[PDB]
Design a protein around this ligand. Structure first.
Ligand SMILES: [N]
Ligand SMILES: [N]
Lengths: 12, 116, 12
């Protein structure tokens, strides 16, 4: 998972 | 000179790319892809020249771009890496497209002679 | 995804 502040996003 | 002022415009475009109003799709591109933290054992196999917005910022501040077109090429390398590595239906691809849409419209409309 | 007032919503 990528993270930035209140955001998350699965890249792997 | 036209080059120095066009580079200044490039900084302004990058600053907008970092702004809150674009964050919901821009944020995956703020920093280098941390292959180790993410466990992406195939990223470096596929992506030979990683690029991200913070690195482009550092290159502008270290004066690594001869002109706006070398700046633009690094921005487009960013997006291309994302299109190349991820499945075409991945959320991050749509996100790259939305940010690219903003970048292309600003980059296209930059004055050809900003010093005048 | 975004953490948004208790919820975790998919905005991307
Ligand atoms: N992933
Ligand atoms: N999304």
């Amino acid at each position: 998972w990528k993270y930035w502040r209140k955001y998350v996003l699965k890249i792997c | 000179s036209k080059v120095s002022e066009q580079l200044k415009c490039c900084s302004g475009i990058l600053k907008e790319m970092f702004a809150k109003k674009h964050a919901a799709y821009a944020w995956p591109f703020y920093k280098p892809v941390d292959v180790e933290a993410l466990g992406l054992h195939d990223y470096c196999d596929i992506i030979k020249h990683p690029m991200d917005m913070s690195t482009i910022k550092s290159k502008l501040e270290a004066r690594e771009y001869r002109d706006a077109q070398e700046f633009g090429a690094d921005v487009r390398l960013m997006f291309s890496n994302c299109y190349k590595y991820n499945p075409p239906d991945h959320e991050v691809v749509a996100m790259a497209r939305k940010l690219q849409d903003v970048f292309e419209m600003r980059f296209a409309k930059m004055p050809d002679e900003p010093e005048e």
